[PDB]
Design an enzyme around this catalytic site. Structure first.
Site, mmCIF file in Angstrom:
data_model
loop_
_atom_site.group_PDB
_atom_site.id
_atom_site.type_symbol
_atom_site.label_atom_id
_atom_site.label_comp_id
_atom_site.label_asym_id
_atom_site.label_seq_id
_atom_site.Cartn_x
_atom_site.Cartn_y
_atom_site.Cartn_z
ATOM 1 N N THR A 206 0.860 -1.203 0.062
ATOM 2 C CA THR A 206 -0.103 -0.047 0.091
ATOM 3 C C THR A 206 0.845 1.192 0.045
ATOM 4 O O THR A 206 1.910 1.374 0.443
ATOM 5 C CB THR A 206 -0.966 0.050 1.421
ATOM 6 O OG1 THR A 206 -2.043 -0.534 1.003
ATOM 7 C CG2 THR A 206 -1.108 1.463 1.728
ATOM 8 N N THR A 207 0.222 2.500 -0.470
ATOM 9 C CA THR A 207 1.076 3.512 -0.649
ATOM 10 C C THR A 207 0.887 4.533 0.645
ATOM 11 O O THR A 207 -0.078 4.293 1.318
ATOM 12 C CB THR A 207 0.564 4.412 -1.910
ATOM 13 O OG1 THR A 207 1.607 5.530 -2.109
ATOM 14 C CG2 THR A 207 -0.729 4.939 -1.638
#
Lengths: 244, 198, 233, 242, 102, 244, 241, 243, 250
Positions: free
Chosen positions: F31-32
């Site tokens: 995930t960013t």
């Protein structure tokens, strides 16, 4: 992990053999030859110095015959460096026995401990065995003159005459051909020199390529004596046995 | 203390040891054997602290028997006494030392002579014609200093002993319930079951 | 490929994967189905106990960790023992030292970190079990899903094990309905049994085959088996 | 090579699986539970005529109310037995009561997975798994007569009847049909003796086979040859009976 | 020098009837001539119908009760909620106590 | 030869550490998450994928605090990330205990750095499968940092990692250019909520939940705190608006 | 330090290192033991790959664990020493703590345990040895003969053999020993043992050594003559037909 | 057998590949550095390449202050650079504490060198992908430059360079000294020596630098410090007004 | 962490060789030449200072080191391995001798100690042998002067003269020719410089050659006076200047 680079120096082959021990023996086979001949009135140790030079200082050298006690000595065949680690622990074991019991350590007792140490590296520790074989020549008042031999496996046995190192098959046969129970020390000394003289990979058998030791009980005393021959001594005896 | 005596005659060693075991106000036993055989020709008498006494003797026993089995040979008395002095000398500087005094008597089958050794909990060892631990020495050493001869026979020695045990029953405060005697010689170790009136 | 990177957990594959951990996860899928779901007042567990022969017994799938917490398992039973036992100590430590009930969220964090340690050091092996933890603490009812990878997640409901997707979907569908079953355990348990029967196939849930656990507001985590689960089959 | 605690792509532990194989090669062992006690039977299996068949111990006592039968690499079972016995006697020292058969079982299973070369969970020192399975039978005031199957996996099941060893797969099938909640101890004795006869390479006799049982009244007892020999005879007869 | 022990007074009494039993104690906790509390319970319900009280040095008394109760907890975890018999409890306490014989 | 990517501390012939590089793969795939250093503090934001409607909203929190003034957020193997934070927590406590003063963000950075760098030295350990963005306010300003599985870390104005790592880096660079005079904490929060929404296009397949925390001298008293309630909704809208 | 698991399971459920340990046993010299009606006899062969040995000193194959129990083996020599020593110490320890010398069955079970242990302990290889342990329990006259192997298994025998060609000599014994009527004499018991060894020793008067153990620590090892004589009398048995 | 290329043991040729591959990693940063000795000061120059715009330039550095008088410049990855630096700082503090005087630049080098030699002999320890240049003005030796590599080797220099274009920088200085005939830069003030350093850097690499393309460190009697962008900017201008 | 290399990295090959010791010796072969010669009243050891850059100062490095005031060493092989061995050697001479008898060890024994170190590096877990060979020269009251060579295997032997490294073969032969048992120290120094000249490609002066002698006691090198029995170190490294002056009478 590290399991990747582990040689597993302590496992059995499918034939029930210990690789490392086997290979270490293979190593010993290229080591200078050493013979131990046990006569009725003494014991003889002789060995061939592997690799020599004009420049090699021989008076200060000792690469095969080591004094462990006053009544025990050993001839070595294999890695000199490895030999010393073991030779020193033996000299200590000898002294501890004395300190504890106030009596000189029986030849076999010293031999067994040394052989147990080797056996250890054979069963646990992931370490390589000692590339060494010993011919122990000592005397005690519980068995008199004794001749023993121990190798990388940690096994040891007694002998009347025996050799280790290179060309053992040839040396053993020659010994097995001329050894007689009623032998005398000088007889053994000769058989010794002659055996080497025939197994030597060298041209001739010169003193500068030899080490000699005898455990005799000089009558005019009553005590057993160890004598590690000096270069000039080996040279004399060499001429006498008729090898000039 | 307890009575631990030892006398070496011509061809044997005799060990006398009190049979009483008192604990405070009551004498709990009158037939106690304060001795252990270390090998066919080596006997060791002991006296000292309540637990240490037996635990040490048996420990020393086990080790000498093990050496015998392992070497299929019987260690000379001298050697056995050296092993014991060493064990005590270690004990003396350990955490909780063994408070045990012992007399070691054996027959050296190789020298063909009897030997007596006296060793205290400190690791003090000395070889003697006759010796004792505790107060016993105080009344018996002069007797033996007087009547002892190296060529005495086992019989002569057993009498010299009876002489000592007598002086001890006369002048000593405690009732030690007599002694148990044992002889060690070329043929081994045997007990004189008739000294309660010999 | 994969053969050169799955010999242990201290190795990453060229795509950044940890196979040993992934094989562990496999042990869970091979395991018997079990379902978990909660409302605002209670949290429930429903498990399908598997058996060896017909002469054998149905191995337990639910373990109680404390009066307010428990979990069901899918995978290597021995590992569930090790883990639930560790969770019991942690619940116990919180009581003795702080006189405080261990929060479900925290139990989860503890589990995660314990699992993780076994995936970064040589010699270890990931755990081969999946856990569904329910519990009632200071912030209500809770449901957690624990994976050997170390990932612990808080959900309204879920299922793990063979054919679990059936139940999971049913829950994912019934969500808005069961999440509101407050002040009525028997109803939340039914929605539980229904969701799990959504993963059946082989057989039908029987009395000595079904297993239910319930914890909540005034309900100390209690387990039900046999005759006890009769009124739900 | 490949760690002793490695997972197979199917989600199993290699060493444990291979461990189960060695077990299949083991002697036969059968157990039948009845409301009158539990019967344990094993195949001595002598590798020679000179071997004194009764020095073959494959059924041992844990406590007066617990005994077990072993199948597979049996030298491995030694430390499991010692542990089980200590656990039983110890529980008694601390609670002044008998150890429940299940707990005794659960205790042994706890040693099972304690193996590796550095498993990050405690100090599991034991290079490989155990190569032997066990049949634990006994009685206790909580759940009466019980039979348990403990494996090198670390898991255990309870059975009304169970057979492990070389003839298991078939023998178990036999039990599946033969067993019923109303068997008597004697019936179970003959049944065990019969199944052993079928699966055994040798002719079943009171020397290459052995029975024993656990009853609330006399506890765990191992039938001496004579008692067995007779049951064997009584079995041949009822068989030829039809 | 530091003295690890203290005395908080108190006195307890236990009588056993034919089908019942009672364990009582005063609720005073003292230190020398001072009263620490007029009400500090000393008799506890450890579960499985077992009542207990360790009287003397309060710190040690609570440590012991606490340890015992913790024992009853695990007894349940270990032997499937089996009730701990009064005599078993007794033997267990003997081990708790003698465990600190020195 | 080959196989220089099977053991964790081995140098390949060109001097690399493949195991570490593979670790990065685990990261990029995560995930960013981002960090924005404003004028008197820092803001942290992260993407939280809703794998299903079963995940309780506002629950599985990612951002972590070290002590009271440090914030952490990472991408990749979550369990690995907590393990790193747990070590930072002890690392910080140890520092405060002896020096009294809460640990300076810079010092904390190197504490984490030396730890991570250490997991690339032995083949008995695995590198960290996470890149971490962390920072806070100390004796002299606010600091933002990012730690790579290799152990490398540097000070940043803005930072991002994970799936949407490139969308973000692009947006952050825009902020840098359009604010040579600085961004306020209030603004960094909204500007952060936007960057996440935009970076979420490289994962537009699954729905997501936003999470932001900030450490501002004027907004939180130099303490780390999560942006909740109103201020959050406001930033959520500011993004939802500019996403269209 | 080193703790690599060397004895582990293979797909077919075998511990190869233990199996290979057995192979080492098969290669070692032969050893045999037969129990009579009032004694037990142990016989071992001596290699001939080399001959110029000093049998006086050279370690013998039958060892005394205690004064009433002996132990012979087949396999690696070095490995036997470790086992013998351990058992010897256990013998003395057991006396000390139980005030009573170990029984043959017990001393055997101990040795077996050591072996079994070395098969599931990291960092060590199994013992390349199999043993024969015989003697009489304390204050008992019934002879005891036991055998142990690398796997850690052990059991008792009326007669048994281990080592090279043990397959042969076992067959010989299986059809020359009757449990019904065991060699009721020390003499005929020593004979059955030499006979059985001659089946494989191939004329070796100096290559065979016997040791007879009688109740109450009565152990003795026959000399070449006493043995040589037995050989002589046996060769006539064949010729006289 | 082919694993003599994965751990630090000998190959048939008597070589240690892992040590060699470590050397390879030192050029990973693509930065060159050089050091020269003044009359009584030592200067170290190093390229500084901060490409990303999101980076905080002030935090990037391969120059470290080991102690009040010793500075170290690292040619290699930063995580190994920082590991090495920390170890050196500790070795520095401890040496002072135990012997009562500041550790000399050469000694610290010898100590770090021996430390590397160990990773060369022990299998579980990997070498560090970095070359270390220590500098100071020893109270006994004067301006000093000592450099160590992953092989455990180290020596003192009149001047030295490290990096991808190491050889160009070396031959350049080599020539300068073949010319001057003396082993240092006969200059009193350090600013002029910094300028000389930067100059020859430019001549050898054939490049112009801005104030953010360099990193300078100076060691004087009782102090080692690094220059700021501006301190350099001023130094850069100076050489400019000479060309 | 934790060194998991608790097994030998040097084992036996089916042929009976010990690979690593062999490869280690190969490394010694590749190294710069160094030699030693025993005279009747001294010993000399020398090697070539093969500078690894004209920017490097070969003075800040010693290939010929002092072990005790009467024992010096020199090598061929891997520099870093020699370096740590010198430190270990100096220490062991103290910890295992001077601290017990209050006197420095005699050549053979100190040499014996060094050998042990190397031997262990041949069998201990997780390590490689040392890639160097040493020529140790010294003098002690009861043994006179001596020269020993210690190999990576851990073996050692005494020599009247010998050389190791690159041109050892050539050098050895040349020495066997010039050596005799009547050489005075100076003669050997001269012979040394000669033998060395062959193995030297480039420059050959006091700044590229490193040579030391174990001769008479240098009271002038003691540092203090007032203790009769303390006569000064016998080991003395020659100066750049001292070398050249002789290079002229070469």
């Amino acid at each position: 992990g590290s399991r990747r680079y582990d040689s597993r120096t302590t496992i059995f082959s499918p034939e029930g053999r210990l690789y490392q021990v086997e290979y270490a023996l293979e190593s010993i086979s290229h080591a200078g030859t050493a013979i131990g001949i046990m006569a009725s009135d003494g014991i003889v140790l002789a060995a061939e110095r592997k690799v020599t030079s004009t420049l090699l200082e021989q008076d200060t050298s000792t690469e095969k015959l080591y004094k462990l006690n006053d009544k025990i000595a050993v001839a070595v065949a294999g890695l000199t460096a490895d030999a010393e680690i073991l030779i020193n622990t033996a000299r200590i074991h000898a002294q501890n026995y004395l300190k504890t019991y106030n009596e000189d350590i029986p030849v076999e007792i010293l031999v067994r401990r040394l052989s147990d140490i080797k056996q250890g590296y054979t069963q646990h520790g992931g370490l390589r065995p000692f590339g060494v074989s010993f011919i122990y020549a000592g005397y005690d008042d519980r068995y008199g003159y004794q001749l023993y031999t121990s190798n990388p496996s940690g096994n040891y046995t007694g002998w009347k005459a025996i050799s280790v190192g290179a060309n053992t098959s040839a040396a053993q046969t020659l010994l097995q051909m001329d050894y007689k129970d009623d032998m005398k020390v000088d007889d053994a000394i000769e058989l010794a020199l002659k055996t080497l003289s025939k197994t030597t990979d060298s041209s001739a058998l010169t003193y500068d390529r030899l080490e000699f030791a005898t455990i005799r009980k000089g009558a005019n005393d009553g005590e057993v004596y160890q004598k590690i021959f000096k270069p000039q001594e080996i040279k004399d005896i060499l001429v006498k046995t008729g090898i000039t | 203390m307890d009575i631990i005596l030892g006398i070496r005659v011509q061809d044997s060693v005799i060990l006398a040891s009190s049979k009483a075991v008192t604990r405070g106000i009551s004498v709990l036993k009158d037939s106690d054997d304060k001795t252990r055989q270390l090998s066919p020709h080596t006997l060791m008498s002991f006296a000292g602290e309540a637990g240490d006494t037996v635990q040490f003797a048996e420990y020393i026993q086990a080790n000498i028997q093990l050496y015998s089995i392992r070497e299929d040979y019987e260690l000379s008395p001298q050697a056995v006494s050296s092993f014991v002095r060493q064990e005590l000398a270690k004990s003396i500087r350990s955490r909780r030392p063994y408070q045990v005094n012992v007399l070691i008597g054996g027959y050296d089958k190789k020298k063909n002579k009897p030997e007596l050794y006296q060793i205290d909990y400190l690791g003090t060892k000395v070889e003697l014609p006759y010796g004792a631990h505790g107060y016993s020495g105080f009344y018996t050493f002069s007797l033996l200093d007087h009547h002892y001869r190296p060529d005495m026979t086992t019989e002569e020695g057993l009498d010299l002993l009876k002489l000592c045990v007598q002086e001890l029953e006369k002048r000593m405060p405690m009732d030690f319930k007599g002694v148990i005697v044992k002889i060690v010689d070329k043929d081994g170790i045997r007990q004189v079951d008739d000294f309660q009136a010999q | 490929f994969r053969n050169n990177y799955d010999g242990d957990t201290v190795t990453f594959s060229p795509t950044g994967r940890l196979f040993q951990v992934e094989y562990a996860l496999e042990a869970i899928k091979q395991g018997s189905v079990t379902v978990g779901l909660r409302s605002n007042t209670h949290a429930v567990l429903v498990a399908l106990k598997r058996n060896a022969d017909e002469l054998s017994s149905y191995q337990k799938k639910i373990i109680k960790c404390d009066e307010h917490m428990g979990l069901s398992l899918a995978g290597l039973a021995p590992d569930a023992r090790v883990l639930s036992n560790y969770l019991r100590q942690q619940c116990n430590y919180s009581s003795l030292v702080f006189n405080r009930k261990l929060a479900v969220e925290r139990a989860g964090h503890l589990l995660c970190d314990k699992a993780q340690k076994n995936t970064q050091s040589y010699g270890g092996r990931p755990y081969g079990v999946g856990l569904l933890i329910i519990g009632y603490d200071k912030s209500g009812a809770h449901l957690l899903e624990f994976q050997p990878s170390g990932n612990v997640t808080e959900l309204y409901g879920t299922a793990i094990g063979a054919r679990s997707q059936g139940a999971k979907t049913y829950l994912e569908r019934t969500l808005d309905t069961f999440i509101k079953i407050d002040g009525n355990p028997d109803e939340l348990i039914k929605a539980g049994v229904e969701a799990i029967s959504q993963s059946l196939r082989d057989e039908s849930l029987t009395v000595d085959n079904l297993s239910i656990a319930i914890v909540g507001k005034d309900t100390p985590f209690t387990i039900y088996d046999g005759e006890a689960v009769a009124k739900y089959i | 090579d490949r760690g002793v605690s490695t997972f197979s792509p199917e989600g199993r532990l290699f060493q444990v699986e291979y461990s189960l194989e060695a077990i299949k090669l083991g002697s036969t062992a059968i157990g039948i539970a009845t409301k009158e006690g539990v019967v344990l039977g094993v195949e001595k299996r002598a590798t020679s005529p000179l071997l004194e068949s009764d020095s073959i111990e494959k059924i041992v006592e844990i406590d007066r109310h617990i005994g077990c039968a072993m199948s597979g690499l049996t030298a491995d079972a030694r430390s499991m037995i010692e542990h089980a016995r200590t656990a039983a006697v110890t529980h008694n020292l601390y609670y002044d009561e008998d150890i429940n058969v299940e707990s005794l079982t659960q205790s042994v299973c706890d040693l099972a997975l304690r193996f590796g070369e550095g498993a990050s969970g405690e100090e599991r020192l034991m290079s490989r798994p155990f190569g032997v399975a066990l049949l634990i039978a006994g009685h206790d005031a909580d759940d009466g007569y019980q039979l348990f199957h403990a494996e090198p996996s670390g898991t255990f099941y309870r059975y009304n009847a169970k057979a492990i060893g070389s003839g298991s797969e078939g023998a178990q099938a036999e039990l599946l049909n033969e067993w019923h909640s109303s068997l008597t101890l004697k019936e179970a004795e003959l049944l065990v003796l019969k199944i052993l006869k079928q699966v055994m390479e040798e002719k079943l006799d009171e020397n290459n086979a052995q029975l024993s049982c656990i009853t609330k009244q006399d506890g765990f007892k191992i039938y001496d040859n004579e008692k067995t020999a007779e049951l064997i005879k009584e079995l041949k007869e009822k068989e030829a009976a039809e | 020098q530091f003295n690890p022990y203290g005395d908080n007074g108190g006195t307890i009494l236990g009588i056993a009837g034919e089908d019942f039993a009672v364990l009582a104690g005063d609720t005073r906790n003292i230190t020398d001539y001072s009263i620490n509390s007029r009400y500090e319970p000393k008799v506890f319900d450890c579960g499985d119908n077992i009542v207990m009280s360790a009287n003397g040095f309060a710190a040690d008394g609570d440590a012991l009760v606490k340890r015992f109760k913790n024992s009853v907890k695990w007894y349940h975890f270990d032997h499937n909620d089996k009730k701990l018999s009064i005599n078993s409890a007794a033997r267990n306490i003997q081990h708790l106590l003698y465990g600190k014989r020195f | 030869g080959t196989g220089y990517d099977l053991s964790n501390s081995v140098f390949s012939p060109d001097g690399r550490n493949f195991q570490v590089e593979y670790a990065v793969k685990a990261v990029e795939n995560g995930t960013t998450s981002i960090g924005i250093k404003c004028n008197d503090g820092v803001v942290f934001a992260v993407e939280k994928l809703i794998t299903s409607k079963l995940l309780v909203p506002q629950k599985n929190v990612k951002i972590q605090v070290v002590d009271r003034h440090i914030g952490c957020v990472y991408s990749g193997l979550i369990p690995d990330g907590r393990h790193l934070v747990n070590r930072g927590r002890e690392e910080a406590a140890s520092f405060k205990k002896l020096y009294k003063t809460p640990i300076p963000i810079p010092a904390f950075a190197d504490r984490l750095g030396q730890y991570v760098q250490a997991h690339t030295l032995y083949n008995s350990v695995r590198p960290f499968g996470v890149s971490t963005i962390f920072g806070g306010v100390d004796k002299n300003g606010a600091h933002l940092y990012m730690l790579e599985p290799s152990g490398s870390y540097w000070g940043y104005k803005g930072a991002a990692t994970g799936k949407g790592r490139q969308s973000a880096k692009a947006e952050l660079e825009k902020l840098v250019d359009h604010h040579p005079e600085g961004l306020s904490a209030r603004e960094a929060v909204k500007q952060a909520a936007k960057i996440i929404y935009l970076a979420h296009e490289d994962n537009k397949e699954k729905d997501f939940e936003l999470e932001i925390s900030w450490c501002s001298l004027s907004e939180t008293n130099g303490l780390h705190k999560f942006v909740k309630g109103d201020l959050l909704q406001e930033a959520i809208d500011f993004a939802q608006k500019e996403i269209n | 330090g080193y703790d690599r698991a060397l004895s582990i399971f293979s797909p077919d459920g075998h511990i190869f290192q233990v199996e290979y340990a057995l192979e080492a046993v098969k290669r070692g010299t032969c050893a045999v033991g037969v129990k009579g009606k009032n004694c037990v006899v142990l016989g071992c062969e001596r290699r001939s790959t080399l001959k110029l040995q000093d049998t006086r000193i050279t370690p013998s194959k039958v060892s005394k664990i205690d004064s009433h129990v002996v132990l012979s083996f087949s396999g690696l020599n070095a490995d036997s020493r470790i086992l013998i020593e351990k058992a010897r110490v256990e013998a003395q320890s057991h006396r000390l703590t139980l005030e009573d010398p170990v029984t043959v069955e017990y001393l055997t079970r101990y040795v077996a345990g050591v072996q079994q242990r070395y098969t599931q302990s990291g960092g060590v290889r199994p013992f390349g040895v199999s043993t024969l342990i015989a003697g009489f329990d304390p204050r008992d006259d019934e002879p005891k003969l036991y055998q142990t192997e690398p796997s850690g298994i052990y059991s008792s025998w009326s007669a048994q053999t281990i080592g090279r060609n043990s397959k042969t000599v076992r067959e010989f014994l299986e059809k020359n020993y009757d449990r019904k009527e065991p060699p009721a004499t020390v003499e005929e018991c020593v004979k059955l043992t030499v006979r059985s060894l001659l089946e494989v020793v191939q004329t070796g008067a100096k290559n065979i050594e016997i040791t007879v153990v009688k109740p109450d620590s009565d152990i003795v090892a026959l000399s070449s003559e006493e043995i040589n004589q037995y050989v002589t009398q046996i060769e006539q048995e064949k010729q006289e037909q | 057998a082919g694993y003599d290329r994965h751990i630090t043991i000998f190959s048939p040729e008597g070589r240690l590949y892992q040590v060699e591959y470590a050397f390879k990693a030192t050029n990973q940063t693509n930065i060159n550095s050089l050091a020269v000795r003044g009359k009584d000061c030592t200067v170290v120059i190093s390229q500084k390449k901060v490409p990303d715009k999101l980076l905080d330039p002030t935090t990037v550095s391969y120059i470290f202050c080991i102690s009040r008088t010793i500075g170290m410049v690292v040619n290699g990855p930063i995580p190994d650079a920082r590991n090495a630096a920390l170890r050196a700082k500790a070795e520095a503090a401890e040496f002072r504490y135990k012997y009562g005087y500041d550790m000399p630049c050469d000694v610290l080098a010898k100590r770090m060198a021996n430390l590397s030699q160990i990773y060369t002999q022990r299998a579980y320890m990997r070498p560090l992908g970095v070359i270390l240049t220590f500098v100071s003005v020893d109270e006994e030796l004067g301006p000093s430059i000592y450099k160590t590599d992953p092989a455990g080797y180290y020596v003192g220099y009149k001047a030295t360079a490290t990096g991808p274009k190491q050889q160009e920088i070396t031959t350049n200085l080599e020539n300068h000294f073949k010319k001057s005939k003396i082993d240092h830069i006969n200059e009193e003030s350090w600013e002029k020596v910094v300028e000389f350093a930067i100059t020859h850097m430019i001549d050898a690499l054939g490049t112009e630098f801005s104030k953010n393309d360099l990193e300078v460190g100076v060691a004087t009697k009782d102090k080692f410090f690094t220059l700021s962008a501006e301190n350099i900017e001023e130094r850069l201008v100076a050489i400019a007004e000479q060309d | 962490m934790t060194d998991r290399y608790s097994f030998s990295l040097t084992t036996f090959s089916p042929s009976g060789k010990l690979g690593q010791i062999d490869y280690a010796l190969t490394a010694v072969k590749q190294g710069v030449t160094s030699l030693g010669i025993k005279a009747t009243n001294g010993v000399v050891i020398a090697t070539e200072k093969k500078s690894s850059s004209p920017l490097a100062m070969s003075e800040t490095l010693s290939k010929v080191s002092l072990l005790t005031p009467d024992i010096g060493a020199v090598y061929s092989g891997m520099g870093p391995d020699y370096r740590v061995l010198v430190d270990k050697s100096r220490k062991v001479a103290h910890t295992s001798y001077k601290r017990i008898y209050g006197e420095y060890p005699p050549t053979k024994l100190l040499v014996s100690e060094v050998a042990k170190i190397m031997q262990e590096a041949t069998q201990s877990g997780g390590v490689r042998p040392f890639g160097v060979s040493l020529l140790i020269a010294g003098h002690d009251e009861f043994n006179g002067f001596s020269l020993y060579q210690v190999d990576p295997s851990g073996s050692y032997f005494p020599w009247k003269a010998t050389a190791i490294g690159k041109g050892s073969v050539a050098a050895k032969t040349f020495l066997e020719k010039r050596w005799n048992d009547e050489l005075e120290l100076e003669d050997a120094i001269h012979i040394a410089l000669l033998t060395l000249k062959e193995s030297v490609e480039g420059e050959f002066n006091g700044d590229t050659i490193e040579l030391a002698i174990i001769g008479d006691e240098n009271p002038d090198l003691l540092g203090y006076t007032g203790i009769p029995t303390d006569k000064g170190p016998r080991f003395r490294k020659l100066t750049s200047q001292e070398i050249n002056d002789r290079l002229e009478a070469l």
